[PDB]
Amino acid sequence: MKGDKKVIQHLNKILGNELIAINQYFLHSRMWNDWGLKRLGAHEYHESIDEMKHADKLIERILFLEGLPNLQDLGKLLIGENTQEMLQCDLNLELKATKDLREAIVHCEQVHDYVSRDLLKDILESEEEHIDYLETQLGLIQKVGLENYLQSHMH
Amino acid sequence: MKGDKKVIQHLNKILGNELIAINQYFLHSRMWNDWGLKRLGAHEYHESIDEMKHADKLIERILFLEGLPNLQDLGKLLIGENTQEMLQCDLNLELKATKDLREAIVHCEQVHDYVSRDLLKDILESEEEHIDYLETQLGLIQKVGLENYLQSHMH
Amino acid sequence: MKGDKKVIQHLNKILGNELIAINQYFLHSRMWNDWGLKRLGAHEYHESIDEMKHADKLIERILFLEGLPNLQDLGKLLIGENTQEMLQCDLNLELKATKDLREAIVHCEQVHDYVSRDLLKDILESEEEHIDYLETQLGLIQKVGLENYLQSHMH
Amino acid sequence: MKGDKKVIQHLNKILGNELIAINQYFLHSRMWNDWGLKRLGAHEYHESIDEMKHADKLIERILFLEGLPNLQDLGKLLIGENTQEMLQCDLNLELKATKDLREAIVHCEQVHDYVSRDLLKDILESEEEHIDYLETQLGLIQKVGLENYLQSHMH
Amino acid sequence: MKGDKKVIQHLNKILGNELIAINQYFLHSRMWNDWGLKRLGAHEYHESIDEMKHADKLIERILFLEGLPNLQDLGKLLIGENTQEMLQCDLNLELKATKDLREAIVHCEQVHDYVSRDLLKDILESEEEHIDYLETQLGLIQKVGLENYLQSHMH
Amino acid sequence: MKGDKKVIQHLNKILGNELIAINQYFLHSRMWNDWGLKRLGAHEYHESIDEMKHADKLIERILFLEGLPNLQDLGKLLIGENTQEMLQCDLNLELKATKDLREAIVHCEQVHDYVSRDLLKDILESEEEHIDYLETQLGLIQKVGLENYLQSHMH
Amino acid sequence: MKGDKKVIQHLNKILGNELIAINQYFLHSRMWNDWGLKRLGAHEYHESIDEMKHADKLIERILFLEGLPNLQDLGKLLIGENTQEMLQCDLNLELKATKDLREAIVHCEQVHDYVSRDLLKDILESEEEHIDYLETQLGLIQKVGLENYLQSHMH
Numbered sequence A, B, C, D, E, F, G: 001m002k003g004d005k006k007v008i009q010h011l012n013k014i015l016g017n018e019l020i021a022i023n024q025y026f027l028h029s030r031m032w033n034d035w036g037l038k039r040l041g042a043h044e045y046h047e048s049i050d051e052m053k054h055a056d057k058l059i060e061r062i063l064f065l066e067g068l069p070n071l072q073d074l075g076k077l078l079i080g081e082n083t084q085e086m087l088q089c090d091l092n093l094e095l096k097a098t099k100d101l102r103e104a105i106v107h108c109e110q111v112h113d114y115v116s117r118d119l120l121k122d123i124l125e126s127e128e129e130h131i132d133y134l135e136t137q138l139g140l141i142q143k144v145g146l147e148n149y150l151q152s153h154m155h
């Protein structure tokens, strides 16, 4: 079904953000696992899987709308060097992601692509849940101290 | 069954205390959850539900006694701004509630409303267990330190 | 995540409506139970629980958006003196509630808070289901007679 | 298998009657549900489902006989404005339907299309069962009074 | 609940489209079954059932909004004379249906009938899935050849 | 219970047709199996069994009517040399059979042997279902091509 | 555990190949699903998952050897425009990948990193199995014809 060209461009921009997030979260996960922080490793793994599922739905929607999904261009990974920085890098990426998602919904609404809007709204709900998780972790570090925070994410 | 007017007023006062406690504990629970202190959030949720059940029984007794249950007037909620203050706020509320319960039981005994007395005694037992919980948490904060106390209430 | 100040104000207004509804439906429920109209009592009890669940979600969303949920201010309960009046009072509250939901949805849409909009839309769907129920009961009283209507809600 | 042209014309007339009945009964069902008369709504829904199944068998038979099933022409729906009129409108439609079935069976017999006759006989048995139901409901309204009758069909 | 008069007109227009699709898809299904293409027949039967379920939700919404559901007027069925034409007739119908759905959603949004919008968005999601199915089938006929395509839909 | 002489002659003519069809379908079944077209062979096998059960019911009715069932005379088997001819030979036989069934039913009706008519009507229904199967297979061969048709009947 | 610098460079080169393959196979899979070739889509999906699992193990080994896994640099995807091209693009990519694997194994052997060698050998076995699958599919296209090959991958 021939989709709106700018919708397809917005979907490819969202897709591009998810592809960054897939790799950043996967690498952060395996770093935390290598350091023995396996509760962080596992949670971050599940965050990377969630982004994979979002990218899948985006690819499927783009193809249905008769566009070409861009899996070639990978933007800049934000990789931290310690736990606090890694959480903050994930948070910075998610804040960029939700900004782009909102702008994409505005345009879907304007050209009456209500099904694409519903898909992006669902993704936005998942990203806002990730932001909640990230902000909460960063706050816990301040409340319990870094050493306790890390201790609590070993097992 | 026509109840004693002053018994009904005592029951409405106790109901009023429960209505404050329902909201105060519910808000505290959701604050703790938002901060990632989910074991405190879950416990405080169950405290709120318990107050809801007490309020239900008070409403039912008042109606049986042909009074009007007062769900309109809501007293002052005592909301803390950190874990220590929230616990102390709950405790201050509970100490007021048990003082009022004792006065109501005296009156029920004087007018021979022994069934209303039995209900209030059951509520008093629940409120004293809540006091025990609260005093114990505040004491644990002193024994293990605040960071450890919060750490133990994350998951 | 820093939410829009006016969205938070709208969410607190919706929450305020739910807090009224909780108490009004709960009292109407216990009145109907006291009168032996237990099917009305049971249905109104479940209406009150539904509003409790909506209030919970509103409170959680407000805190996530870094606002303060208002559980202190309780508006005017509309309590009837007989079954017909009680249902109409519920219906009057629900019509106020849905007007406020529609205005809050408008504002969420305009600041691109599409997750808050989706939550409010779900709550609006529940409120229109309650309106349907309430309108239908009032119509049934006219079709079958008050004595039959009440008879069918004894057990 | 090449069927008798006039048989196919009869079958399309019966089909036309079923198509009216599908819509008439389905609308009556949903009107009754909207009014809170859900037992009436459920029974009328099952009547609509029955006509749908008859229409299916007629379409299949017409196609086997190398005719064209007519699903384009929809005759006049008879919609009541109250329970009594709706039942009478169903009954009036059924009495026309059984007259057309009898005339179709006469013709199937004359041209030795014994299988089409057997199908129509089965449909006629169903329509007579519906006539029994409808006459019985209209009689019950007289024996128990409209208010009781409707009361008995709320749940 | 007093609905917007123009929302109700839109809902009756969408319902009119569903009524056409019910009949068109049911006839196509029984044509394919008669021809021995039972996988197509079964798939098209389920499409017809999906439209029946949409029509039901539309009728119920219109009645709740205090409008009259129009089941009397039936627009033009697009019936093909071979498999390729039947799929293209279905696709042409669906493209008109989704155009009308978008226009209806615009109006629901403008008068704040967000529940009607939600129902129409769900239907649109179902219709776009049907468009995907149909476009894919017509593409497969080109890729594998008509003879193979029909072979794969016999059993 | 002594039957009408000419009814018994009709039943014996029908029985004679069924005896031809038993052997013709059984041989066709085993030819297809020998050729590796086992799905055709299995379906034709079940057609032969169907005719065996019809013959059984005819034999039992003739004996009950105190006639002698003719299992001695076997008319001409129509054996094809390839799939299309075999199906056409089956169809030609079925069309003679249904013509004979119709004449027999006319006579049963004239002499008021309604039970024999009902048995012949049931057999006629099965024979018209076989005609449908055969016409449909001949149509599929045209639509998917003989090679694909046979391919789909190998396993 | 401090790894050989050149081993880690080899491991990142193999990882880069896996990252290309993940994306190329995932897109090919979703292209085939969009075209209705679901069996090709599902098989290609499992190939993409396989490469994801290989990339994970390489990431984990690089980190253990105290190197930095390179998830930032993504080489050129080879995307076909039809089924034959897509299979040949996959095969071209696999043949480059196995050449790189062989060179990395040579170097692991020379510096006695026998566990890295074993990991790469396991990956090489999986890639040779993919080469087997792809060569076989391309030959089947020649043996059964493209239309039959695609027909067999519809369901």
Ligand code: HEM
Residues within 6 Å of the ligand: A019, A022, A023, A026, A049, A052, A053, A055, A056, G019, G022, G023, G026, G049, G052, G053, G055, G056, G071
């Ligand atoms: C750095 C790149 C990637 C890595 C290391 C990776 C890793 C993984 C792993 C380890 C799994 C679990 C497989 C299993 O054991 O079942 C997985 C699943 C999955 N991946 Fe990826 N992946 C990557 C990129 C992608 C991309 C780009 C996509 C889509 C565009 C994607 C889509 C999926 C899907 C749909 C699943 C299945 C999730 C489920 O339903 O369980 N992945 N991935």
Ligand code: HEM
Residues within 6 Å of the ligand: B019, B022, B023, B026, B049, B052, B053, B055, B056, B071, C019, C022, C023, C026, C049, C052, C053, C055, C056, C059
């Ligand atoms: C008059 C004030 C209230 C009364 C009498 C009341 C009463 C009740 C009762 C009797 C229950 C059932 C508990 C059980 O399982 O035994 C309940 C459940 C619940 N209440 Fe309340 N409640 C009140 C106010 C509130 C408020 C203000 C909130 C939220 C802000 C709330 C949130 C909940 C929730 C989330 C549940 C459980 C729902 C579920 O289990 O699905 N309640 N309430």
Ligand code: HEM
Residues within 6 Å of the ligand: D019, D022, D023, D026, D049, D052, D053, D055, D056, D059, E019, E022, E023, E026, E049, E052, E053, E055, E056, E071
């Ligand atoms: C106003 C038009 C119609 C409406 C609103 C409608 C509605 C429905 C609904 C709600 C169902 C139940 C679906 C389920 O839960 O599985 C159904 C089933 C069905 N419909 Fe319709 N329908 C309509 C017209 C038709 C027509 C014209 C036909 C055939 C000519 C038809 C044939 C069927 C059949 C065969 C079933 C399956 C019943 C069963 O075996 O359970 N319908 N319909």
Ligand code: HEM
Residues within 6 Å of the ligand: F019, F022, F023, F026, F049, F052, F053, F055, F056, F059
């Ligand atoms: C060429 C002549 C015939 C052949 C090759 C034949 C073959 C068969 C076969 C292979 C079976 C299945 C047996 C089993 O269950 O293992 C069967 C069943 C049967 N046959 Fe025949 N048959 C022939 C003629 C007849 C005749 C002339 C009659 C009656 C007049 C007859 C009546 C039956 C019946 C009643 C069954 C049982 C079917 C059931 O109810 O499952 N058959 N036959």
Ligand SMILES: O=C1NC(=O)c2c(NCCCc3ccccc3O)cccc21
Residues within 6 Å of the ligand: A067, A068, A069, A070, A071, A072, A073, G027, G031, G077, G078, G079, G080, G081, G082
């Ligand atoms: O990342 C990428 N996404 C793409 O679509 C792509 C390429 N496309 C070639 C045409 C793919 C195509 C052809 C026909 C029909 C539908 C189709 O989808 C090439 C390189 C990299 C990328």
Ligand SMILES: O=C1NC(=O)c2c(NCCCc3ccccc3O)cccc21
Residues within 6 Å of the ligand: B067, B068, B069, B070, B071, B072, B073, C027, C031, C077, C078, C079, C080, C081, C082
């Ligand atoms: O918080 C409140 N509690 C109440 O009872 C109430 C009101 N009463 C109206 C008559 C309640 C009533 C009428 C008839 C028989 C028994 C009854 O119990 C009004 C406003 C607020 C409140």
Ligand SMILES: O=C1NC(=O)c2c(NCCCc3ccccc3O)cccc21
Residues within 6 Å of the ligand: D067, D068, D069, D070, D071, D072, D073, E027, E031, E077, E078, E079, E080, E081, E082
């Ligand atoms: O309601 C309707 N019923 C119909 O058959 C019909 C139409 N016919 C197209 C030819 C259907 C057909 C074509 C070829 C072979 C066998 C066939 O069966 C057109 C419009 C409306 C209707």
Ligand SMILES: O=C1NC(=O)c2c(NCCCc3ccccc3O)cccc21
Residues within 6 Å of the ligand: D027, D031, D077, D078, D079, D080, D081, D082, E067, E068, E069, E070, E071, E072, E073
């Ligand atoms: O297709 C049709 N849809 C309709 O509603 C209709 C008719 N209406 C009669 C009054 C329906 C009605 C009456 C009282 C209360 C509520 C009501 O809803 C007449 C003919 C055809 C149609």
Ligand SMILES: O=C1NC(=O)c2c(NCCCc3ccccc3O)cccc21
Residues within 6 Å of the ligand: F068, F069, F070, F071, F072, F073
């Ligand atoms: O197919 C057959 N059915 C039978 O009943 C039958 C036979 N019966 C012996 C009675 C012989 C008989 C009875 C009445 C009148 C004339 C007669 O010559 C013998 C061979 C074949 C068949």
Ligand SMILES: O=C1NC(=O)c2c(NCCCc3ccccc3O)cccc21
Residues within 6 Å of the ligand: A027, A031, A077, A078, A079, A080, A081, A082, G067, G068, G069, G070, G071, G072, G073
């Ligand atoms: O694709 C990439 N792979 C990487 O490692 C990487 C970056 N490294 C930051 C340091 C990660 C690190 C820090 C301390 C200790 C061990 C560590 O492992 C930066 C950008 C992109 C990439």
Ligand SMILES: [K+]
Residues within 6 Å of the ligand: E148, E151, F148, F151, G148, G151
């Ligand atoms: K083939």
